[PDB]
Amino acid sequence: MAGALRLVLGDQLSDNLSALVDADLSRDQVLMVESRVEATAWKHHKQKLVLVWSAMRQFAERLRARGFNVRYVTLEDPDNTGSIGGELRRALEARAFDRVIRTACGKWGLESHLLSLDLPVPMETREDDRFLCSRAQFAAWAEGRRELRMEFFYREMRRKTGLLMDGDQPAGGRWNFDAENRRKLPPGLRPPERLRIPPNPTTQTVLEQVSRGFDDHFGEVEGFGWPTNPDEATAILDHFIADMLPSFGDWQDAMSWRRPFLWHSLISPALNIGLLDPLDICRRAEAAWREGRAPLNAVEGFIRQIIGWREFVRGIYWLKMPEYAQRNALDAQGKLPGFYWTGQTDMACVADTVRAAHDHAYAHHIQRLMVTGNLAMLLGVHPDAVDDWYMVVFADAYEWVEMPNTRGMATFADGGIVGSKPYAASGAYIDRMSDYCKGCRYDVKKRLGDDACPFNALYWDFIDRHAQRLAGNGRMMMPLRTLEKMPDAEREAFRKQARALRVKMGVS
Ligand SMILES: Cc1cc2nc3c(=O)[nH]c(=O)nc-3n(C[C@H](O)[C@H](O)[C@H](O)COP(=O)(O)OP(=O)(O)OC[C@H]3O[C@@H](n4cnc5c(N)ncnc54)[C@H](O)[C@@H]3O)c2cc1C
Numbered sequence: 405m406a407g408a409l410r411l412v413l414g415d416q417l418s419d420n421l422s423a424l425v426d427a428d429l430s431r432d433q434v435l436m437v438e439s440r441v442e443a444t445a446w447k448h449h450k451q452k453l454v455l456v457w458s459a460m461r462q463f464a465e466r467l468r469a470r471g472f473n474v475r476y477v478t479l480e481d482p483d484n485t486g487s488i489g490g491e492l493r494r495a496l497e498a499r500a501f502d503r504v505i506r507t508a509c510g511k512w513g514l515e516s517h518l519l520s521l522d523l524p525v526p527m528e529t530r531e532d533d534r535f536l537c538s539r540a541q542f543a544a545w546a547e548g549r550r551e552l553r554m555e556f557f558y559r560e561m562r563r564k565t566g567l568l569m570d571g572d573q574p575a576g577g578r579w580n581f582d583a584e585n586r587r588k589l590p591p592g593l594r595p596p597e598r599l600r601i602p603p604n605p606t607t608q609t610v611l612e613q614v615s616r617g618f619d620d621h622f623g624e625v626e627g628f629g630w631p632t633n634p635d636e637a638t639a640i641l642d643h644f645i646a647d648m649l650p651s652f653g654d655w656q657d658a659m660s661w662r663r664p665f666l667w668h669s670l671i672s673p674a675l676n677i678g679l680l681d682p683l684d685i686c687r688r689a690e691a692a693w694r695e696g697r698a699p700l701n702a703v704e705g706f707i708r709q710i711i712g713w714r715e716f717v718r719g720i721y722w723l724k725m726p727e728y729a730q731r732n733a734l735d736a737q738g739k740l741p742g743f744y745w746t747g748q749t750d751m752a753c754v755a756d757t758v759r760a761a762h763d764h765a766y767a768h769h770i771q772r773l774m775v776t777g778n779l780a781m782l783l784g785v786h787p788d789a790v791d792d793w794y795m796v797v798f799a800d801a802y803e804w805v806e807m808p809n810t811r812g813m814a815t816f817a818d819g820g821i822v823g824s825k826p827y828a829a830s831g832a833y834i835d836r837m838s839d840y841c842k843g844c845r846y847d848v849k850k851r852l853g854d855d856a857c858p859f860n861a862l863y864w865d866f867i868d869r870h871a872q873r874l875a876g877n878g879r880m881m882m883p884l885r886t887l888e889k890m891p892d893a894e895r896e897a898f899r900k901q902a903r904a905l906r907v908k909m910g911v912s
């Protein structure tokens with residue numbers, strides 16, 4: 405009789421959100437809050453603040469155009485209590501409501517808090533059915549499995565969604581086309597220019613507000629080019645499918661100095677706040693293969709990242725929280741080096757990754773994994789400090805997707821739940837996959853001395869340190885044998901080198 409209060413959070417900017425689907429436009433009200441609690445829980449990159457608040461403001465206008473009564477509480481409002489819970493209470497004092505309806509969110513701590521709120525009306529929490537696997541479906545799949553392997557989850561999602569299925573068989577006769585012959589770019593191949601979205605008038609307004617009011621947050625705002633509404637996001641997606649997808653598979657793991665985008669889709673910051681739909685993106689990519697515009701290996705590689713990795717890490721997060729966020733399997737206790745924030749390091753690969761984070765709030769997957777993620781793991785940085793960095797510096801970072809990729813896949817702080825084996829690597833890997841080392845001050849062919857690439861001694865120290873644990877893992881057989889044949893003097897030398905580096909870098 406009085407209507408429902410419907411909450412929409414900053415990463416829920418979708419017409420099809422479960423909290424909106426059955427609204428009574430004549431009686432109901434939508435609440436959206438620009439919340440300083442959420443904006444300072446981590447000190448997010450300036451560009452992430454611009455993206456979320458610009459997109460929120462535009463989504464509110466789209467709802468109003470459709471006939472919704474929207475209560476929009478801006479960051480400038482002098483009565484704004486600052487928190488989601490406080491603003492819910494205040495909305496419930498302003499007029500009569502029958503219930504609150506909301507969609508379960510993407511942060512365990514906020515979800516736990518909202519479920520415990522004492523409110524004068526009932527609250528109904530609906531699952532976020534924008535994702536392709538529900539929380540209960542992942543738990544059912546995971547029951548009774550001694551280890552959770554993404555590849556077997558991926559096969560189930562292929563069958564459930566029907567993507568790249570010809571009848572009951574996978575297209576092409578294999579599930580996966582992952583190649584092992586990944587290489588760096590040929591010396592003459594210049595990566596293509598990428599479409600960036602110039603700030604529209606709403607985004608320009610938010611840009612000025614963030615510059616003036618959050619000047620202490622990490623990162624540059626100049627040159628902001630992320631999409632902030634479904635039209636802008638669709639343009640980015642069209643550009644990727646038409647222009648980039650045919651080469652997606654060839655260069656998925658390559659790195660190139662000062663070319664942070666390469667052939668990646670650049671859609672995660674829009675997808676993670678709801679401006680694009682995961683099933684629609686995948687259908688678009690499948691159609692490009694079916695109609696002869698992209699090869700199957702590229703399209704399968706792309707889809708696997710969305711219905712395989714993205715749904716899998718979300719499943720692990722809700723299955724294992726809150727204990728997951730407390731695990732520190734390798735007892736890492738070091739500090740994060742200051743160059744993660746300033747970029748002021750002679751390691752050319754690290755400096756470039758930090759530069760991309762500062763200027764664009766983006767780096768692609770192998771850079772996050774094998775450069776700054778691997779380095780943090782080898783240094784022994786406390787996982788809390790690594791999660792903080794990955795949450796701050798990237799525009800696509802939300803806890804449900806950051807934490808299993810960071811505490812799990814990149815640093816092995818979860819002891820192998822997400823990724824099975826540590827992704828440890830020496831400089832030889834970065835040299836094989838990038839053009840960084842020819843321009844670097846350090847010599848990637850050396851392990852000891854002031855000119856040695858720091859990854860090389862750090863890698864062997866890490867293997868040495870954890871040799872008993874990594875033994876019986878199964879997938880570390882080759883490094884452990886190599887270490888085993890090393891005379892004690894060789895091992896003592898790289899131990900003392902690794903110790904020196906941790907001091908030089910401010911870790912210990
Ligand atoms: C340490 C570390 C931290 C990460 N933190 C985040 C994060 O906070 N947010 C985030 O969205 N991704 C995160 N990733 C995953 C991946 O790096 C990003 O999704 C990707 O770089 C986004 O670029 P893109 O849109 O150009 O992706 P593409 O290379 O074009 O891939 C297509 C899509 O696949 C999905 N995807 C690919 N890899 C993953 C993955 N491992 N997990 C989840 N989705 C994936 C994304 O939706 C992405 O848009 C992290 C990976 C690592 C190693």
Ligand SMILES: Cc1nc2c(=O)[nH]c(=O)nc-2n(C[C@H](O)[C@H](O)[C@H](O)CO)c1C
Pocket residue numbers: 412413414415437438439440442443448452453456509510511802803
């Ligand atoms: C920066 C930021 N700001 C807001 C905000 O002002 N209002 C809001 O409702 N949500 C915001 N968010 C997203 C949440 O803090 C959180 O990460 C997601 O809702 C996870 O579900 C973020 C990340």
Ligand code: SF4
Pocket residue numbers: 750751752753754831832834835840841844845846847848857858859
């Ligand atoms: S030599 Fe070492 S530090 Fe320098 S770019 Fe190569 S991997 Fe990075």
